[PDB]
Symmetry: D2
Subunit: 336 residues, 4 copies
Amino acid sequence: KLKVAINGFGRIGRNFLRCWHGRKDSPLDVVVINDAGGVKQASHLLKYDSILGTFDADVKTAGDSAISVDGKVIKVVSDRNPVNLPWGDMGIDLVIEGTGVFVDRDGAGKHLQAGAKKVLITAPGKGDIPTYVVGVNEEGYTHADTIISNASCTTNCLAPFVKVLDQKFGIIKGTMTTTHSYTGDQRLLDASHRDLRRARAACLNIVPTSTGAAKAVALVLPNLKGKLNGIALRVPTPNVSVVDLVVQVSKKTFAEEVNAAFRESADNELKGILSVCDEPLVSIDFRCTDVSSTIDSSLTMVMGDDMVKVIAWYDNEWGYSQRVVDLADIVANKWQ
Amino acid sequence: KLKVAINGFGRIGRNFLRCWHGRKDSPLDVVVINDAGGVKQASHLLKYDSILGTFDADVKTAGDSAISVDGKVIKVVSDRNPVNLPWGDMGIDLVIEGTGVFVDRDGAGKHLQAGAKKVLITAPGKGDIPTYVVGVNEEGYTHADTIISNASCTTNCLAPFVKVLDQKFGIIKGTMTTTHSYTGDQRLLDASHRDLRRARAACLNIVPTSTGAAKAVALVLPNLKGKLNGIALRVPTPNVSVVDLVVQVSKKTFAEEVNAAFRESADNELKGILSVCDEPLVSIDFRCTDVSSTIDSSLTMVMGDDMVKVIAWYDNEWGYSQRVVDLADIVANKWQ
Amino acid sequence: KLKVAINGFGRIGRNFLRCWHGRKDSPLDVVVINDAGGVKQASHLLKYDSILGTFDADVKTAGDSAISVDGKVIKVVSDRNPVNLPWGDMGIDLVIEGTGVFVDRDGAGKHLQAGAKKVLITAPGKGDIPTYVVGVNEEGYTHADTIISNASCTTNCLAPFVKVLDQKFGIIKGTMTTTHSYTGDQRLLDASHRDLRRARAACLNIVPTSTGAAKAVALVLPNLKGKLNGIALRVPTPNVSVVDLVVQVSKKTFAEEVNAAFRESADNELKGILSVCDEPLVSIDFRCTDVSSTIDSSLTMVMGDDMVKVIAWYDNEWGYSQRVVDLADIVANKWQA
Amino acid sequence: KLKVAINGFGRIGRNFLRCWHGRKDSPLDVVVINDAGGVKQASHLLKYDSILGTFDADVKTAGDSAISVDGKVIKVVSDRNPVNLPWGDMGIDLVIEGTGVFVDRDGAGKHLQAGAKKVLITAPGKGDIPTYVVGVNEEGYTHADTIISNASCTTNCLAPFVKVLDQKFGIIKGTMTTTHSYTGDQRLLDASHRDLRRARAACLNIVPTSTGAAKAVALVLPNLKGKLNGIALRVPTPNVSVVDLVVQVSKKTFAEEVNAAFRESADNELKGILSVCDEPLVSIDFRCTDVSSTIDSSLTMVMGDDMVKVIAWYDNEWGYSQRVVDLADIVANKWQA
Ligand SMILES: NC(=O)C1=CN([C@@H]2O[C@H](COP(=O)(O)OP(=O)(O)OC[C@H]3O[C@@H](n4cnc5c(N)ncnc54)[C@H](OP(=O)(O)O)[C@@H]3O)[C@@H](O)[C@H]2O)C=CC1
Ligand SMILES: NC(=O)C1=CN([C@@H]2O[C@H](COP(=O)(O)OP(=O)(O)OC[C@H]3O[C@@H](n4cnc5c(N)ncnc54)[C@H](OP(=O)(O)O)[C@@H]3O)[C@@H](O)[C@H]2O)C=CC1
Ligand SMILES: NC(=O)C1=CN([C@@H]2O[C@H](COP(=O)(O)OP(=O)(O)OC[C@H]3O[C@@H](n4cnc5c(N)ncnc54)[C@H](OP(=O)(O)O)[C@@H]3O)[C@@H](O)[C@H]2O)C=CC1
Ligand SMILES: NC(=O)C1=CN([C@@H]2O[C@H](COP(=O)(O)OP(=O)(O)OC[C@H]3O[C@@H](n4cnc5c(N)ncnc54)[C@H](OP(=O)(O)O)[C@@H]3O)[C@@H](O)[C@H]2O)C=CC1
């Protein structure tokens, strides 16, 4: 019931399509896809995936202008410049901007120029762009918004439980470290990169790198402005990441009280977004989890009664993608 | 000038031998080695190493009771039970206990029974065993000690800079997380293990696990008793690890002041033990570093003036081994 | 029907249970497991798998003596010594031996001493033990065999299509190499091992190691006695392997014909055993394939009309386990004691 | 002596510089580098290497136009378009082309348009470009060749011992497979790529991919035209590869004899090019070996007296680079313009 266009059929673009496919009675209708790769490439890389495994659905080529998924057809275009896109011609209502290169208002606006009605950036938007994290501040959304951001994968894992920590105990200050799976932005072997660390062989190193999730939390949760900072450590795993948040709170507490606070939310206002796991699991066990963040309850610690340490897992590819579909769903429900 | 016996020719045992080999005018004399493996195995695995690379020295078999290194001969025995060892027969002064199974007083004492004069455990000693970290409290050592511990690799990285942080700013409370390279204690593929997490495929997961380094710091630095706790995250790298320490201090400070405090120590009382790196490096760049801990100066952060976050690198195998040689050197210099 | 006991709940042991669980109207009944690790461990590792993913079934501990899967309770014992197992007491018909330590008659025989009626080794048997490969020589099995072998994962991948090659082109001689994923027998980090190459860090090296798969093929395809040989190259992947076979055939041929020969068999004789893939895929795309061998068609080459090169993929864990289930199924159907 | 310019400071480009740096009394003088990434980047990546380790030399930036290694200053420029390079202005004699994008005459020719006197491609040339393999056909090079190719890392590993086999046993036909470490052309995570197999996550798969190494061997050893073929299997290791060759030889032989043949050549003809290792080693033990091919003796097999299987290791980065240095050395010694 809503014409959606996928701009950039990469990890997020493909995960998004498969996430959408699995939804029941979806308000969205993916009609077109744009990628620098060919049509035979789109179908091949959509059907076979080194992380999600083979797609359980009939995926084949539909000529040279489209692909087929369980019968349904989806147009396939290719144009590095968004302005030259048939968005208007097709009456595209929403464009899923997942190229990683059109994050500001100028770049992302080119979709609007091409005739698109609205755009959702699958990443933090630079400049003055409204960003939303489902379960944290999506209510602030309004159809009047033509360009919106769904933040980063890390921000979607952090915001949900930081919100609980702040409402229940009151965060004073804090730092975070995310031991993150490597991503396409890194190099397979030591090679040129503006970030001299991300330039190093990704499957061979623990790669420290900056993160904006810490400060970005303040966007969706104003009360946290200037209260958090952090860094990231990219490690040799292909997917699934973990956040290590340490905060000083105003109200004294203890490990199990903190955990119970998370469970209360997980069962109510954050059901489907936040989860608490009591099992002694490892990263691979969290692949394909729909929630944005899963607290490893047994790792929660409190030092000196007011320094809380929380460990939360998140499938950076799949989990975030479900959040993209959710935000897109909201756009379709609060339309015109 | 001191008969040393290597009990357990594993990662630490082999690294220790190669570390010792590189020392100039060493007070130590490695005369014997004991391992569950054969003689041809000891020489092969000593000469070829997937982490340290090929040993630059002539290593060959010396029959069925010894091996040869650059000409020098070293006896090779094999006996799972230490009591049945020719320590007394050879007049062994010090035994480098690196089997990982004789960590308490009963088990490690068996070396003394076999005729050994003293034992140095290359790991935290369980029970009432004096533990020392060079550069932190080695002065407390006395020849009267028959069984001593050199703590863990993590404790040797943490203690050095925690000592500086506490003397210069006064630690109130803190938590730590070590993103650690996998070790032999983990499983290559999901298999039986008392620790249900360490039981999972090590090259495929981020594996949370308990650590005693946090509490162990209190042994070598009494003032820290009950002030720190922490966890470990084993990741898919074969060697080199990193500590992420967050502490609340009494004296307000800022990132560069903290770094300068580390440099001051690195240049004086902690020269050779602690180091500060201003380069934007990654884990592989710290392999074979002799220091116990290297602060990544650009990652240092301070939140709200009294919450300090420090990131320090350490070669868990090689770096720790140099510390083993150092403690052994001390034992030889404060002998009888 | 058949009372089955699993001895050694490792990769194959757990892949076996899950393989069995997926079968419909199984003639087998897994009633007990001998896990050295314990009940909590058996339940946890069965539920969570780094390769197979989370078992889609309700798995929990049952008291301190068993576990349950979707309600079916399975007893759990722990004795490293087979002779002390309550096999006779429980009336165990078939013991699935997947410890990797009781691969010879004296070892496996211990299960018989404990009362089990028959033992099936999930690996090449050592010595005079009959070995079978489903799709190649299973018909040779008889209820009289007290100790059988299901061969290795490599033999199960090779034998099937080698059989097609031989009967269709006549194999004169040949050699093969398997680029194999690492396994529990290798070392995570450089450490003691009888095989000085397997002693080296598995996730960091290309590790050459001997293989009996080539010779083992003669045990199931007598016609190829002393005609094949080869080695293995253990590489840094957790599961799924690939065999590279180069044979000199009597009949001059060409790639397209060789592939066509495989397709015929795959569609008939070896349906469910051998497969042919025309897609340009990679190792991971073959995880959880039930067949024991999948020919990569586009890689088939023929040099000088008589030198054939074949590349076949195989899930050394899941595909092999499915075969162990099939062989056990034959033991049940051929039973009648 | 020879004014050398490095175009493309990638894995080979940097391995080259370090290889050159280790040489004594080199006839080459590296005076400029064209790095798209910049000066700080060229200096940093030259100093810190995830595979080679930290360069044991004082490496720093020099102003904003150059870098220096142990005091020797090397200019750095950045133009993705070769035609605009100051080659003529600097009087560059030889351009080391390691970008992987100017592998044909029209591409490499751009360096000549910019004033360089000669171009040496660190990869198979596309089209009518003469290609050489040090130890096999270097003597065929003449100063008249303006654009040459040093072939691929796989061709440099195969050719050398294939030459020994052919002249000592006569190769009738053959096929090979190289279990190759991944390279920058593969994708870190599933992503767009002309080669649908190379598009797949490199550290997570066994990736089959085509190779020209077999055919390329004919360019340096004419005698083997149309006699060999093969493929490549990219595996999860960062560096070092291994070639698996299976050939049918005219003269009946046996493993011990084949190995002995390699040792003779290694000790004479191909000393410093071919080597023979009797140790049971693994991939990592061959990092930084100067030879371009090391025969794993204990793995040599012969099936039916005429089917020979050879396994040879090679550091596709460092060994190849050392060869690029040698070929450049021949350009200098054979110069005289
Ligand atoms: N991976 C993850 O865990 C998450 C990523 N994100 C964000 O999503 C974005 C993309 O990331 P990710 O999918 O991971 O990375 P990928 O590189 O896998 O996806 C980016 C895609 O953009 C495509 N592309 C680039 N330019 C164009 C263009 N101009 N027109 C059409 N297609 C184009 C690229 O095609 P080609 O390959 O041909 O160059 C590539 O397929 C980034 O903003 C990232 O931060 C957010 C959450 C999670
Ligand atoms: N790796 C690292 O980063 C560090 C490890 N350590 C500590 O050092 C110890 C060993 O660790 P590590 O070297 O890493 O592990 P390894 O398993 O590589 O070394 C342990 C060795 O003990 C040998 N061994 C076991 N029992 C005996 C015995 N009874 N007699 C003779 N030899 C025996 C084992 O032989 P076999 O393999 O035949 O069973 C193995 O070679 C542990 O205490 C560990 O915590 C401390 C600092 C750093
Ligand atoms: N992995 C694969 O791809 C294939 C393996 N195989 C074969 O199957 C066998 C096992 O291999 P795999 O599962 O891979 O390896 P694992 O090591 O994962 O399994 C072996 C199991 O045997 C258990 N065990 C050892 N001794 C005993 C005992 N005495 N009593 C009870 N349990 C015991 C071990 O327990 P613990 O860990 O407590 O020591 C371990 O769980 C081998 O014969 C192997 O060659 C065949 C086909 C495929
Ligand atoms: N790696 C190995 O094992 C071997 C590789 N080779 C061959 O060498 C070549 C390069 O391979 P490799 O070093 O491995 O790969 P890399 O990608 O690491 O090196 C290629 C380099 O070319 C640079 N580059 C691209 N275009 C230009 C340009 N127009 N001007 C200046 N610099 C440019 C790239 O810069 P940037 O990253 O900024 O895009 C990159 O640094 C290929 O021909 C390859 O087949 C041969 C033997 C061995």
